[PDB]
Each structure stands twice: as structure tokens, then as C-alpha cells.
Short mmCIF file of C-alpha atoms and ligand atoms in Angstrom, two decimals:
data_model
loop_
_atom_site.label_atom_id
_atom_site.label_comp_id
_atom_site.label_asym_id
_atom_site.label_seq_id
_atom_site.Cartn_x
_atom_site.Cartn_y
_atom_site.Cartn_z
CA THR T 1 -11.85 -134.54 157.10
CA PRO T 2 -12.07 -133.84 160.84
CA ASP T 3 -15.12 -135.02 162.78
CA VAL T 4 -15.07 -132.19 165.35
CA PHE T 5 -14.72 -128.44 164.87
CA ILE T 6 -13.84 -126.54 168.05
CA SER T 7 -14.92 -122.88 168.04
CA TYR T 8 -13.70 -120.75 170.93
CA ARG T 9 -12.59 -117.30 172.09
CA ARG T 10 -8.80 -116.93 172.28
CA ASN T 11 -8.76 -114.56 175.23
CA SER T 12 -11.01 -116.72 177.42
CA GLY T 13 -11.45 -120.27 176.04
CA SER T 14 -7.97 -121.15 174.81
CA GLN T 15 -7.03 -123.58 177.58
CA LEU T 16 -10.40 -125.37 177.70
CA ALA T 17 -10.51 -125.64 173.89
CA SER T 18 -7.08 -127.29 173.96
CA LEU T 19 -8.04 -129.58 176.84
CA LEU T 20 -11.14 -130.60 174.89
CA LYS T 21 -8.99 -131.30 171.85
CA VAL T 22 -6.60 -133.53 173.79
CA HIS T 23 -9.40 -135.62 175.31
CA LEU T 24 -11.37 -135.99 172.08
CA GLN T 25 -8.25 -137.13 170.22
CA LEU T 26 -7.60 -139.68 172.99
CA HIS T 27 -11.12 -141.01 172.38
CA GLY T 28 -10.55 -141.38 168.63
CA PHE T 29 -12.02 -138.21 167.07
CA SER T 30 -10.20 -136.14 164.48
CA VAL T 31 -10.33 -132.59 165.86
CA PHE T 32 -9.95 -129.25 164.11
CA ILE T 33 -8.72 -126.36 166.23
CA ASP T 34 -7.18 -123.37 164.46
CA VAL T 35 -3.69 -123.34 166.03
CA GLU T 36 -3.02 -126.93 164.88
CA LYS T 37 -5.08 -127.42 161.70
CA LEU T 38 -5.70 -124.06 159.99
CA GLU T 39 -2.95 -124.08 157.43
CA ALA T 40 -1.79 -122.17 154.36
CA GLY T 41 -4.12 -120.01 152.29
CA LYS T 42 -6.91 -117.48 152.61
CA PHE T 43 -8.20 -118.31 156.07
CA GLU T 44 -11.70 -116.97 155.35
CA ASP T 45 -12.31 -119.88 152.97
CA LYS T 46 -10.32 -122.43 154.97
CA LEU T 47 -12.17 -121.77 158.24
CA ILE T 48 -15.66 -121.88 156.69
CA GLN T 49 -14.82 -125.08 154.79
CA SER T 50 -13.43 -126.64 157.96
CA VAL T 51 -16.72 -125.93 159.76
CA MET T 52 -18.59 -127.46 156.80
CA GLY T 53 -16.41 -130.57 156.74
CA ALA T 54 -16.88 -131.49 160.40
CA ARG T 55 -20.02 -133.30 161.54
CA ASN T 56 -19.68 -131.98 165.10
CA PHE T 57 -19.39 -128.29 166.08
CA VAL T 58 -18.14 -127.94 169.68
CA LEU T 59 -18.70 -124.38 170.93
CA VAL T 60 -16.66 -123.25 173.94
CA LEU T 61 -18.86 -120.86 175.94
CA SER T 62 -16.36 -119.30 178.30
CA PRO T 63 -17.48 -116.14 180.13
CA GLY T 64 -18.40 -113.42 177.65
CA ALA T 65 -17.55 -115.63 174.66
CA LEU T 66 -20.41 -114.21 172.56
CA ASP T 67 -19.77 -110.56 173.53
CA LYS T 68 -17.95 -109.69 170.29
CA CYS T 69 -20.87 -111.21 168.31
CA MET T 70 -23.26 -108.62 169.74
CA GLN T 71 -24.30 -106.05 167.10
CA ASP T 72 -21.86 -107.73 164.67
CA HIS T 73 -24.47 -107.54 161.94
CA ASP T 74 -21.97 -107.29 159.07
CA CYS T 75 -20.69 -110.69 160.28
CA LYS T 76 -17.07 -109.71 160.92
CA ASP T 77 -16.52 -111.65 164.16
CA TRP T 78 -15.11 -115.12 163.68
CA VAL T 79 -17.06 -117.00 166.36
CA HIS T 80 -20.18 -115.42 164.83
CA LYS T 81 -19.08 -116.58 161.36
CA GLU T 82 -18.40 -120.11 162.59
CA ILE T 83 -21.75 -120.38 164.39
CA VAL T 84 -23.73 -119.16 161.38
CA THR T 85 -21.97 -121.70 159.16
CA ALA T 86 -22.59 -124.51 161.67
CA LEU T 87 -26.25 -123.48 161.95
CA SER T 88 -26.86 -123.23 158.20
CA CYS T 89 -25.30 -126.66 157.54
CA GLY T 90 -27.43 -128.29 160.27
CA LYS T 91 -24.32 -129.38 162.14
CA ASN T 92 -24.38 -131.23 165.47
CA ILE T 93 -23.78 -128.20 167.70
CA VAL T 94 -22.54 -129.03 171.20
CA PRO T 95 -22.06 -125.97 173.43
CA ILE T 96 -19.66 -126.38 176.35
CA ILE T 97 -20.71 -124.15 179.25
CA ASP T 98 -17.83 -122.77 181.31
CA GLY T 99 -19.07 -119.83 183.37
CA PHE T 100 -21.14 -118.56 180.43
CA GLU T 101 -24.23 -116.58 181.35
CA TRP T 102 -27.28 -117.07 179.17
CA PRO T 103 -28.09 -113.82 177.35
CA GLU T 104 -31.40 -112.63 176.06
CA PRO T 105 -31.61 -113.66 172.38
CA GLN T 106 -32.32 -110.09 171.20
CA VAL T 107 -28.75 -109.01 172.09
CA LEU T 108 -27.39 -111.37 169.35
CA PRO T 109 -27.69 -110.94 165.58
CA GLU T 110 -30.71 -112.80 164.26
CA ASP T 111 -28.69 -115.25 162.15
CA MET T 112 -27.07 -116.79 165.26
CA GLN T 113 -29.79 -116.61 167.95
CA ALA T 114 -30.69 -120.26 167.28
CA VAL T 115 -27.37 -121.33 168.87
CA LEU T 116 -28.93 -120.86 172.34
CA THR T 117 -31.57 -123.51 171.49
CA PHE T 118 -28.97 -126.30 171.48
CA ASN T 119 -28.50 -128.41 174.63
CA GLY T 120 -25.26 -127.44 176.39
CA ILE T 121 -22.90 -129.41 178.61
CA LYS T 122 -21.84 -127.75 181.85
CA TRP T 123 -18.09 -128.05 182.37
CA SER T 124 -17.18 -129.33 185.87
CA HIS T 125 -13.64 -128.72 187.18
CA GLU T 126 -14.13 -131.35 189.91
CA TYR T 127 -15.66 -133.98 187.55
CA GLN T 128 -13.77 -133.45 184.29
CA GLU T 129 -13.65 -137.10 183.27
CA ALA T 130 -17.44 -137.34 183.60
CA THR T 131 -17.80 -134.09 181.64
CA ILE T 132 -15.69 -135.54 178.80
CA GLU T 133 -17.69 -138.77 178.82
CA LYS T 134 -20.88 -136.71 178.38
CA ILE T 135 -19.37 -134.71 175.50
CA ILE T 136 -18.48 -137.98 173.74
CA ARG T 137 -22.08 -139.20 174.06
CA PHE T 138 -23.29 -135.98 172.44
CA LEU T 139 -20.87 -136.48 169.56
CA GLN T 140 -21.93 -138.10 166.27
CA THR M 1 3.56 -140.92 196.07
CA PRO M 2 3.08 -138.78 192.93
CA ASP M 3 6.08 -137.53 190.93
CA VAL M 4 4.57 -134.11 190.15
CA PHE M 5 2.57 -131.71 192.32
CA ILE M 6 0.66 -129.03 190.40
CA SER M 7 0.05 -125.77 192.28
CA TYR M 8 -2.36 -123.33 190.68
CA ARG M 9 -4.92 -120.58 191.21
CA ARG M 10 -8.49 -121.86 190.81
CA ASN M 11 -9.95 -118.65 189.37
CA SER M 12 -7.27 -118.30 186.65
CA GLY M 13 -5.27 -121.51 186.14
CA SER M 14 -7.70 -124.42 186.51
CA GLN M 15 -7.81 -125.18 182.80
CA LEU M 16 -4.05 -124.98 182.21
CA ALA M 17 -3.39 -126.97 185.39
CA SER M 18 -5.80 -129.66 184.18
CA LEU M 19 -4.29 -129.63 180.68
CA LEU M 20 -0.82 -130.07 182.17
CA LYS M 21 -2.05 -133.02 184.26
CA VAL M 22 -3.38 -134.85 181.19
CA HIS M 23 -0.19 -134.32 179.16
CA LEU M 24 2.12 -135.30 182.01
CA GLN M 25 0.12 -138.46 182.76
CA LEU M 26 0.22 -139.42 179.07
CA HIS M 27 4.02 -139.23 179.29
CA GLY M 28 4.16 -141.50 182.34
CA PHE M 29 4.23 -139.18 185.36
CA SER M 30 2.03 -139.63 188.39
CA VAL M 31 0.47 -136.22 189.02
CA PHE M 32 -1.10 -134.61 192.08
CA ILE M 33 -3.75 -132.02 191.36
CA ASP M 34 -6.20 -131.30 194.17
CA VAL M 35 -9.51 -132.07 192.41
CA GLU M 36 -8.24 -135.52 191.42
CA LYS M 37 -6.03 -136.62 194.31
CA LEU M 38 -6.81 -134.61 197.45
CA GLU M 39 -8.92 -137.12 199.35
CA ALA M 40 -10.34 -137.61 202.83
CA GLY M 41 -9.08 -135.93 206.00
CA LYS M 42 -7.79 -132.59 207.19
CA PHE M 43 -6.68 -130.99 203.95
CA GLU M 44 -3.98 -128.77 205.47
CA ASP M 45 -1.93 -131.79 206.53
CA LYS M 46 -2.64 -133.72 203.33
CA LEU M 47 -1.77 -130.87 200.96
CA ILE M 48 1.58 -130.25 202.64
CA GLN M 49 2.43 -133.95 202.72
CA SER M 50 1.62 -134.08 198.99
CA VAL M 51 4.01 -131.22 198.19
CA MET M 52 6.62 -132.87 200.45
CA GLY M 53 6.28 -136.24 198.73
CA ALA M 54 6.52 -135.11 195.11
CA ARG M 55 9.92 -134.54 193.50
CA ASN M 56 8.62 -131.94 191.04
CA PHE M 57 6.63 -128.83 191.90
CA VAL M 58 4.88 -127.39 188.84
CA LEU M 59 3.56 -123.89 189.55
CA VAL M 60 0.96 -122.48 187.14
CA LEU M 61 1.71 -118.76 186.88
CA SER M 62 -1.47 -117.45 185.30
CA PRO M 63 -2.10 -113.67 185.42
CA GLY M 64 -2.24 -112.41 188.99
CA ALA M 65 -1.53 -115.90 190.33
CA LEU M 66 0.60 -114.59 193.21
CA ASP M 67 -1.61 -111.57 194.02
CA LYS M 68 -3.20 -113.28 197.03
CA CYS M 69 0.30 -114.12 198.29
CA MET M 70 1.14 -110.44 198.66
CA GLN M 71 1.02 -109.31 202.30
CA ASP M 72 -0.06 -112.81 203.38
CA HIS M 73 2.35 -112.62 206.27
CA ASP M 74 0.34 -115.13 208.35
CA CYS M 75 0.79 -117.59 205.42
CA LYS M 76 -2.96 -118.28 205.06
CA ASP M 77 -3.01 -118.31 201.24
CA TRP M 78 -2.78 -121.84 199.87
CA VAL M 79 -0.55 -121.11 196.90
CA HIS M 80 1.76 -119.28 199.34
CA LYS M 81 1.77 -122.33 201.65
CA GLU M 82 2.50 -124.79 198.84
CA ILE M 83 5.37 -122.67 197.48
CA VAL M 84 7.01 -122.27 200.88
CA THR M 85 6.75 -126.03 201.40
CA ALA M 86 8.32 -126.65 197.98
CA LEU M 87 11.15 -124.20 198.71
CA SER M 88 11.77 -125.62 202.19
CA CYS M 89 12.08 -129.17 200.84
CA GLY M 90 14.35 -128.15 197.95
CA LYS M 91 11.93 -129.49 195.35
CA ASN M 92 12.48 -129.15 191.60
CA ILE M 93 10.27 -126.08 191.07
CA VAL M 94 9.11 -125.61 187.46
CA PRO M 95 7.07 -122.43 186.92
CA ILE M 96 4.77 -122.38 183.89
CA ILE M 97 4.34 -118.82 182.57
CA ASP M 98 0.90 -118.02 181.07
CA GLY M 99 0.43 -114.27 180.90
CA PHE M 100 2.07 -113.86 184.32
CA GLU M 101 3.71 -110.48 184.95
CA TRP M 102 6.99 -110.63 186.83
CA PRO M 103 6.66 -108.65 190.09
CA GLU M 104 9.38 -107.00 192.06
CA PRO M 105 10.35 -109.51 194.78
CA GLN M 106 9.67 -107.10 197.67
CA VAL M 107 5.88 -107.22 197.04
CA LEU M 108 5.96 -110.97 198.03
CA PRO M 109 6.46 -112.34 201.55
CA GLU M 110 10.15 -112.94 202.10
CA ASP M 111 9.73 -116.70 202.65
CA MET M 112 8.59 -117.22 199.04
CA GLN M 113 10.58 -114.63 197.05
CA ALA M 114 13.06 -117.30 195.93
CA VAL M 115 10.30 -118.81 193.76
CA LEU M 116 11.01 -116.19 191.07
CA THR M 117 14.66 -117.24 190.81
CA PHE M 118 13.63 -120.55 189.23
CA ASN M 119 13.73 -120.95 185.47
CA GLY M 120 10.18 -120.80 184.06
CA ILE M 121 8.61 -122.11 180.85
CA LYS M 122 6.56 -119.76 178.66
CA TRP M 123 3.28 -121.46 177.72
CA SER M 124 2.71 -121.20 173.95
CA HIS M 125 -0.83 -121.61 172.65
CA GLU M 126 0.51 -122.12 169.10
CA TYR M 127 3.24 -124.64 170.08
CA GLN M 128 1.68 -126.57 172.94
CA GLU M 129 3.33 -129.86 171.99
CA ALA M 130 6.74 -128.14 172.06
CA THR M 131 5.87 -126.55 175.40
CA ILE M 132 4.93 -129.95 176.86
CA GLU M 133 8.18 -131.50 175.61
CA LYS M 134 10.16 -128.70 177.27
CA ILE M 135 8.26 -129.22 180.55
CA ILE M 136 9.03 -132.94 180.45
CA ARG M 137 12.71 -132.09 179.95
CA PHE M 138 12.56 -129.97 183.13
CA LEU M 139 11.05 -132.81 185.19
CA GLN M 140 13.01 -135.42 187.19
C1 Q1F E 201 -7.49 -114.10 161.93
C2 Q1F E 201 -7.06 -115.24 162.89
C3 Q1F E 201 -8.23 -116.07 163.34
C4 Q1F E 201 -9.29 -115.49 163.99
C5 Q1F E 201 -10.38 -116.32 164.40
N1 Q1F E 201 -10.38 -117.65 164.15
C6 Q1F E 201 -11.56 -118.48 164.62
O1 Q1F E 201 -12.29 -117.75 165.37
C7 Q1F E 201 -12.12 -118.29 166.88
C8 Q1F E 201 -11.18 -117.35 167.61
O2 Q1F E 201 -11.83 -116.07 167.51
P1 Q1F E 201 -11.18 -114.75 168.33
O3 Q1F E 201 -10.79 -115.07 169.75
O4 Q1F E 201 -12.07 -113.52 168.25
O5 Q1F E 201 -9.75 -114.40 167.53
P2 Q1F E 201 -9.37 -112.89 167.00
O6 Q1F E 201 -9.27 -111.95 168.19
O7 Q1F E 201 -10.40 -112.43 166.01
O8 Q1F E 201 -7.90 -112.99 166.20
C9 Q1F E 201 -6.87 -113.73 166.82
C10 Q1F E 201 -5.50 -113.17 166.28
O9 Q1F E 201 -5.30 -113.56 165.04
C11 Q1F E 201 -4.26 -112.59 164.56
N2 Q1F E 201 -4.29 -112.45 163.22
C12 Q1F E 201 -4.91 -111.50 162.50
N3 Q1F E 201 -4.67 -111.75 161.21
C13 Q1F E 201 -3.91 -112.87 161.10
C14 Q1F E 201 -3.34 -113.64 160.05
N4 Q1F E 201 -3.53 -113.24 158.67
N5 Q1F E 201 -2.62 -114.72 160.34
C15 Q1F E 201 -2.43 -115.09 161.59
N6 Q1F E 201 -2.93 -114.41 162.60
C16 Q1F E 201 -3.67 -113.30 162.37
C17 Q1F E 201 -4.58 -111.24 165.36
O10 Q1F E 201 -3.31 -110.90 166.09
C18 Q1F E 201 -5.51 -111.54 166.17
O11 Q1F E 201 -5.25 -111.02 167.52
C19 Q1F E 201 -11.70 -119.52 166.81
O12 Q1F E 201 -12.90 -120.44 166.85
C20 Q1F E 201 -11.02 -119.65 165.45
O13 Q1F E 201 -11.33 -120.82 164.82
C21 Q1F E 201 -9.37 -118.27 163.54
C22 Q1F E 201 -8.27 -117.51 163.11
N7 Q1F E 201 -6.10 -116.13 162.20
C23 Q1F E 201 -6.10 -116.32 160.71
C24 Q1F E 201 -5.12 -116.86 163.04
O14 Q1F E 201 -5.13 -116.72 164.20
N8 Q1F E 201 -4.16 -117.77 162.39
C25 Q1F E 201 -3.17 -118.50 163.22
C26 Q1F E 201 -3.62 -119.91 163.47
F1 Q1F E 201 -2.69 -120.56 164.22
F2 Q1F E 201 -4.81 -119.83 164.12
F3 Q1F E 201 -3.81 -120.59 162.31
C1 Q1F E 202 -9.79 -125.40 200.84
C2 Q1F E 202 -9.78 -126.00 199.41
C3 Q1F E 202 -8.42 -125.93 198.78
C4 Q1F E 202 -7.77 -124.67 198.61
C5 Q1F E 202 -6.51 -124.64 198.01
N1 Q1F E 202 -5.93 -125.76 197.58
C6 Q1F E 202 -4.55 -125.69 196.93
O1 Q1F E 202 -4.17 -124.47 196.80
C7 Q1F E 202 -4.29 -124.09 195.24
C8 Q1F E 202 -5.66 -123.47 195.01
O2 Q1F E 202 -5.61 -122.20 195.66
P1 Q1F E 202 -6.91 -121.12 195.56
O3 Q1F E 202 -7.34 -120.83 194.13
O4 Q1F E 202 -6.58 -119.83 196.29
O5 Q1F E 202 -8.22 -121.90 196.25
P2 Q1F E 202 -9.18 -121.21 197.40
O6 Q1F E 202 -9.80 -119.97 196.82
O7 Q1F E 202 -8.34 -120.93 198.65
O8 Q1F E 202 -10.35 -122.33 197.81
C9 Q1F E 202 -11.10 -122.87 196.75
C10 Q1F E 202 -12.47 -123.33 197.36
O9 Q1F E 202 -12.28 -124.30 198.22
C11 Q1F E 202 -13.59 -124.31 198.96
N2 Q1F E 202 -13.44 -124.83 200.19
C12 Q1F E 202 -13.18 -124.20 201.35
N3 Q1F E 202 -13.12 -125.13 202.33
C13 Q1F E 202 -13.35 -126.36 201.78
C14 Q1F E 202 -13.41 -127.70 202.26
N4 Q1F E 202 -13.22 -128.00 203.66
N5 Q1F E 202 -13.65 -128.70 201.41
C15 Q1F E 202 -13.84 -128.45 200.12
N6 Q1F E 202 -13.78 -127.22 199.63
C16 Q1F E 202 -13.54 -126.16 200.44
C17 Q1F E 202 -14.12 -122.79 198.85
O10 Q1F E 202 -15.32 -122.80 197.95
C18 Q1F E 202 -13.18 -122.17 198.27
O11 Q1F E 202 -13.69 -121.13 197.34
C19 Q1F E 202 -4.14 -125.19 194.58
O12 Q1F E 202 -2.71 -125.39 194.12
C20 Q1F E 202 -4.58 -126.31 195.53
O13 Q1F E 202 -3.72 -127.37 195.51
C21 Q1F E 202 -6.50 -126.97 197.71
C22 Q1F E 202 -7.77 -127.06 198.33
N7 Q1F E 202 -10.17 -127.42 199.47
C23 Q1F E 202 -9.94 -128.28 200.68
C24 Q1F E 202 -10.84 -127.99 198.27
O14 Q1F E 202 -11.02 -127.29 197.35
N8 Q1F E 202 -11.27 -129.40 198.25
C25 Q1F E 202 -11.92 -129.92 197.02
C26 Q1F E 202 -10.90 -130.65 196.19
F1 Q1F E 202 -11.54 -131.23 195.12
F2 Q1F E 202 -9.95 -129.77 195.75
F3 Q1F E 202 -10.28 -131.63 196.93
#
């Protein structure tokens, strides 16, 4: 069972999510990211179970990464689904801030607004090694 | 003197450029990327000497990466300057294609049009390990 689940937006967080995966693996964590670890079967169940199995939930907040969650009240968006699972299991949620702008909570569905209450790590292009070192300290 | 110089657009290729630097270092290449290796002094001289000293010139072609090169006839754009230096020194130029759209050569200053005649590597988010292995094949 992986220690770290990486949740991210394909169109904006793909490279950072992969960079995060490489570094965390180098530091000894088993990492789930979809393109390498989501395998055969009904992905609805597999994704949710993969969130549940991982102690750490690393959320890549690229610019606009929560836009598709807004008014997604029937819970069809996958970042939304992953956050709600992580929240309801009391996971160690570690947001990674990469040009994300903090929205008013009321623009998000009520079941995921608590994600903004978790302490986030600002990603620094100039000081990436120090950013990674901080992420590792936040990890459990 | 680094083996590999990575040229990239900050607003669109920072994450891929950083991800390439990690992978290439893990496979034994010394890498120049500006935020890690550009140190003290007048940066115009140091950047050009770094291109000149590195056998391999890896160019991150993220979307729009050459836009600022267009009509830069005074050669003030830094990606434009690095490419012309690479072409003038006959470096092994390895373009990495990440959502880049191939322009008609005439929209680029004539002293860098030859960059598009080099064989490029399509970045695959699903098969990153395979992509990295191909890149390492291209390197000298
Ligand atoms: C469904 C898809 C998927 C979606 C979301 N998330 C979780 O949500 C975050 C990303 O969210 P988001 O950026 O919004 O992605 P989304 O735009 O919604 O869909 C992306 C593309 O999947 C294509 N596609 C649609 N249907 C299928 C399908 N049946 N099979 C394969 N592709 C499908 C469609 O072409 C769409 O364009 C991440 O945290 C990730 O963990 C995980 C997975 N999926 C199952 C998938 O990829 N499998 C490939 C794998 F390599 F990832 F395993
Ligand atoms: C000048 C800058 C620099 C520019 C370009 N390139 C090479 O060209 C490609 C990137 O091209 P490009 O994306 O177009 O960057 P550009 O927009 O033009 O400038 C980006 C930001 O530099 C800021 N800034 C301006 N003036 C200075 C200055 N005196 N000092 C520090 N910052 C300065 C300004 O804030 C601007 O916004 C890459 O391949 C890279 O190799 C390399 C370097 N620079 C010297 C720099 O960063 N030093 C920090 C370091 F960590 F990178 F070393």
C-alpha cells in the first residue's frame, strides 16, 4: 500500500505532480500517481481505495486547480472526489501551492471546503530542494 | 563544465525543465539549469559560456516557447540567444516536445530557424520513464 497519494489537475499540474513523485520516491516513500499506479478495473473503486490506502494526501494546487470542483455538487469531478475521500478518512492532507490563488470557501461545494484549512507548502522554483525537504517533514 | 544545458521558458517549462534535470542527474549527467547553476557575475557572459561549454543542448519546447523569439531581431530574448549560441557552436541540440506547435520557419528570426530541423522527442505523461530513456539515448 502506497504511503502518498498525489492528486492533481492534468492540464496544469502534470509536470509538478511527476516531479513530486520522483523526489518522494528518492526519499523512500511509495507514491501513487494515476499514470503509473492506477491499473486494471473499474477506476471509480480503484481511485477511491487508493486514496483510502495512503496515509498522506498530497494535493497539487496549480493555478485554477479547483475550478472544475466549483458547483460540482453531484461530485462528478475527480479532484473533488479525491479531496472528499481524503477529508472523510482524516488523511494527512498536504497542499502544494504553485500559483494557486486562495478562493472564498463559498465557491466550493460544502463537502470539500475544509481542504483550505490545511497548511500548504509554497512551491519555489529557485529553492526546489528546500521545498522538497519541507514536504518530507510534513509527511507521516 | 556541465554535459547538458537546459534551455526553457520560465512561464511554461519550469516544471518540465526541472523534472528533466533530476532524471538526467540520476543517470550520471552534469546538468546546467539557471536556477541551480547560474551563479555570480554578469549573467549575459555566464549564460553564453555555459551553452558554449556543454556538449548537449536540451531545449524545452512547451506551448508558445518560441513566441518571444518571433521578431526579436535585436536578439534580446534569452531563449533566442541560447539557441543561436547552440547552433553557432554545433552543439547536439535535443528538443523536448510538450504541447509545442510547429511554426512555419519564416515567423522565427533567420539565425535560429535551423533549430526546427533537429529531431525532437515527444514528452509522454503516461510513459515518462520511456521518454527519459529516449532522451538519454539522444545525449552524448
Ligand atoms: C477517467 C481518468 C481519470 C480522471 C481523473 N483521475 C484523478 O483525478 C486527477 C486528474 O483529474 P483531471 O485533470 O480532471 O482528469 P480528467 O480531465 O477528468 O480526465 C483525464 C482523461 O482521462 C481520459 N479518460 C476518460 N475515461 C477514461 C478511461 N476509462 N480510461 C482511461 N482514460 C480515460 C479522458 O480522455 C480524459 O481527458 C488526478 O488526481 C487523478 O488521480 C484519474 C483518472 N482515467 C481513468 C485515466 O486517466 N486513466 C489512465 C491512467 F493512466 F490514469 F490510469
Ligand atoms: C535575467 C534572468 C534570466 C533570464 C533568462 N535566462 C535563460 O533564458 C531561459 C529563460 O528565459 P525567460 O523565461 O524568457 O526568462 P525572462 O522572462 O527573460 O527573465 C526571468 C526573470 O528574471 C528576472 N531578472 C531580470 N534581471 C535579473 C537579474 N539581474 N537577476 C536575477 N533575476 C533577474 C525578471 O524577474 C525576470 O522576470 C532560460 O533557458 C534561462 O537559462 C536566465 C536568466 N536572470 C539573470 C535570472 O533569472 N537569475 C536568477 C537565476 F536563479 F536564474 F540565476
